[PDB]
Design a protein around this ligand. Structure first.
Ligand code: CAP
Ligand code: CAP
Ligand code: MG
Ligand code: MG
Ligand code: MG
Lengths: 455, 456, 160
């Protein structure tokens, strides 16, 4: 069925839809499946299944319904491009506080339309949210600013936070776990649970949390510097999340503001993210995106990009989200991913298709992680342009030949090298921990610094 | 780095791993990315990133850690197949009640491994959960049996529940919405919110719920039959979900057990599903899977299949989940998808790779939806083999030339046609609403029943 | 929450968004729900912001829920008439923590899509820090309006 006359209006001007401030805009790369309708016919059906319609005519439709129809307003078949305008009235709102929910945005813009038989594939690359809709989202309540304050750093451009992940990913018992925490903290700032760590039978939650709390006190007493930990509180059950968060804060007591809460936001879902954001607004919300690659990978032509994921996370209220290593680590990523960081940190930024004003909504920290080490950092910072961020290196830290403490210091010195604009190999001559990272990861050293051994 | 010596043990026997009952097994179709390690090397790194390891050696690893390593135990590079055994000790448990969480299963089995640079793609096609881990999941608390009971049907094989979705998807104001509900209920059993319907500014939640409650009373008074409604209570905020559910049940009062709760489980996530399952265990939990196609589509070689999604939903405690039309409707699906239905309904069933014993865990209803109408139903039932299910037809009902009530009856008569083993075109001669579905959807009629006009 | 969040609702710049024109509903007490709401509508035709006078709440002649409903209607009518956003600051002060919650929760549900136009007023000096914190922690996304009635007993330069 051809629904183009109803759901397509290519005469609409994007600048006017934006100026109007009554529409969410979404940009897709879509391709019709062979043996069905043409591009505009397919786009029209796509819009219907994403707003007010279905695959056939229904007598129950009235003019009020047609008034809130989503509309395809711009197409470019040669480039498989499709842009759709969603009246903001379509999106669900909370009965309890009249605020927006990302779940509704997802259901409409990237829901049932991902199962359409007449569509080969469709993926969202960008979206625009107008002020009237934007202001209804929670946004971040805690930012990197609050971590800088605890660390005793300037609250403006407080600089690089040296982080790690406790490795093994799973298998460490409570005290061996806490011992590794202490070791790293002698040289580093920040430690996060690896994403699956919680209440395993061999590492009970409360025992581990208590041991880590003791390690933090010991590390802070030894170094005279503040230390941070990000605990995984992810669960299916809302009340389990509350129980974990509540126990952690009571346990850390006077160090409670040194605690971040990690949530596996992609697999547990927006509901889990919001549980943490609304229950613990004064604790840094650390969004871990495990599983995201199933749709965000450039190998996938479905779902949405990492850029879209990141932008949504800022609205949901993540204090920080993993943005990837931008091609410099072990995970899939491109150097161009730097644009993701800018979109979540700045008050105004450009996406692949839409400019976004954030209207003073708090920033979300780009958390850099995935096969990073001291050697790979100078190149990463050069591409990004700043080090006002958290970087976690698990293997990069505990894989250091001289141990976790030395690993931490190598990360510290690596960023110091980049800020000083010094040559890494020349810099290494006066910085042992950094130099020993070459010996720790010789395969990496050979690639990045061909004749590092001679010098 | 080659981690095959640690994370691969192809000498392990699947029958023994299953017999042991200490391992979750997962089957993937994976392809290494060119310019990295071979198949077994790549599978080894995959296993490391999905259990206990990372991409390099760390001094903190001990022999206890190696003991809980996941292991690739079976490979077939020619068919891109990879099977991994996960010690159940790896999976997270609730502090509050010691029960399992699907979030941990996902984090490990299909989490970070979906972003690996040395892997071109990897997708889970099946998984096995042993008794020790299986018994820790909530499972469904309400089933179709509880809907049959309200309808006055037999609680065993109570039969086909005629359903629809209120269309337009969005745009109907509270009373026009309720009017459509009333009309359909004159001929049908079951109505669900279209998945995005909730508290839109033009259709406030409480006003719509009140109007629908009135429509249910009026329809039940008119027909003398019980009517069902499935309300969307999906939200980001746990407390919004509770507020919606609590208001609905108070409003419907003596009809409160006629209410199902719909949750957009894929986009809102397992956390939202569990909110409804644990807060409202005595209300039918209707899992709507909007967005799933982004990974479950056969066009995708990442994530997991719809089979995997459906099996997870039963563990999570869905009373019913959309399983698709199995190729007979408007959404992507194949006739072979019938196996999904069997996996969520039976106490024992076979997946593409693993046999599963459910140990008396309640079944999850196959909810059939997506471009269905009276004409397409006989063929669908032929492929599945039974009609003990809920089928919702939005366009199929309200797109009927004679309206929603006639639409409902055409669906009713279509299943009766299949049950009697009658010829649809011959059956139509004596059943007007069914016959009028041919005129309502002529393109479908021409394809499905050549020369129907001549015979009608 | 800060004035930035009010500026955002008014469509003003979120930095140095400028002057917010406000008033207090007078008589301090004595207006019944609809006469109260009528005064709100009238002011909102030219102004941005209205606060409860500090003692206004659930007086027997002006029941809380009836007044909140009437004011909510006035806000919609005023916003439709002027095409500009309007703000209200409601007194939710009480001895009982749970009364404060009940008032705040009812206001936000009633105002619905205008819920972010709502500020909560707390008579912080007489009800105390405990009352201020109840509102701050229970409703962090709503502008917290600290009314200092009674402060003059110590803050006055006449007092040493
Ligand atoms: O489990 C892991 O692999 C990590 O702890 C990194 O460990 P290593 O530092 O030892 O490699 C992080 O979770 C990934 O970076 C997640 O990827 P992303 O940030 O792209 O979401
Ligand atoms: O919005 C829709 O399209 C539907 O209400 C069907 O309406 P129609 O009857 O008018 O087609 C269902 O949500 C889809 O079937 C979901 O797909 P699935 O069941 O595959 O998850
Ligand atoms: Mg990790
Ligand atoms: Mg639907
Ligand atoms: Mg006053």
């Amino acid at each position: 069925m051809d629904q183009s006359n109803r759901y397509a209006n290519l005469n609409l001007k994007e600048s006017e839809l934006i100026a109007g401030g009554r529409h969410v805009l979404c940009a897709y790369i879509m391709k019709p499946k062979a043996g069905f309708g043409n591009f505009i016919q397919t786009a029209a059906h796509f819009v219907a299944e994403s707003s007010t319609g279905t695959n056939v005519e229904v007598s129950t439709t009235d003019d009020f319904t047609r008034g809130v129809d989503a509309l395809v307003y711009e197409v470019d078949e040669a480039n498989s491009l499709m842009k759709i305008a969603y009246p903001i009235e379509l999106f669900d709102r909370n009965v309890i506080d009249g605020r927006a929910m990302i779940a509704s945005f997802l259901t409409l813009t990237i829901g049932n339309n991902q199962g359409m038989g007449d569509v080969e594939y469709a993926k969202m690359y960008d979206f625009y949210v107008p002020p009237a809709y934007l202001k209804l989202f929670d946004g971040p309540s805690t930012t990197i600013k609050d971590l800088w304050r605890v660390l005793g750093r300037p609250v403006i451009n407080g600089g690089f936070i040296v982080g790690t992940i406790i490795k093994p990913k799973l298998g460490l018992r409570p005290q061996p776990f806490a011992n590794a925490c202490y070791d790293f903290w002698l040289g580093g700032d920040f430690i996060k649970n690896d994403e699956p760590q919680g209440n395993q039978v061999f590492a009970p939650f409360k025992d581990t949390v208590r041991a880590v709390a003791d390690a933090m006190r010991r590390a802070q007493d030894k170094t005279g510097e503040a230390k941070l930990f990000s605990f995984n509180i992810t669960a299916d059950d809302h009340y389990e999340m509350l129980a974990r968060g509540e126990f952690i804060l009571e346990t850390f007591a006077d160090n409670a503001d040194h605690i971040a809460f990690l949530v596996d936001g992609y697999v547990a879902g927006p509901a889990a993210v919001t549980t943490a954001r609304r229950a613990f607004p004064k604790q840094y919300l650390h969004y871990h995106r495990a599983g995201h690659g199933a749709v965000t990978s450039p190998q996938s032509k479905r779902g949405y990009t990492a850029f879209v994921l990141s932008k949504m996370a800022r609205l949901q209220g993540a204090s920080g989200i993993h943005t990837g290593t931008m091609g410099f680590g072990k995970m899939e990523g491109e150097a161009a991913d730097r644009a993701i960081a800018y979109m979540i940190t700045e008050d105004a930024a450009d996406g692949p298709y839409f400019h976004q004003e954030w209207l003073g909504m708090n920033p979300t920290t780009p958390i850099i992680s995935g096969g990073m080490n001291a050697l790979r950092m100078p190149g990463f910072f050069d591409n990004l342009g700043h080090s006002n961020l958290i970087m976690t290196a698990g293997g990069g830290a505990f894989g250091h030949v001289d141990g976790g403490a030395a690993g931490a210091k190598s990360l510290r010195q690596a960023e110091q090298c980049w800020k000083q604009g010094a040559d890494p190999v020349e810099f290494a001559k006066d910085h042992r921990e950094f130099a020993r990272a070459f010996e720790s990861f010789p395969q990496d050293a050979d690639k990045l610094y061909p004749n590092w051994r001679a010098k």
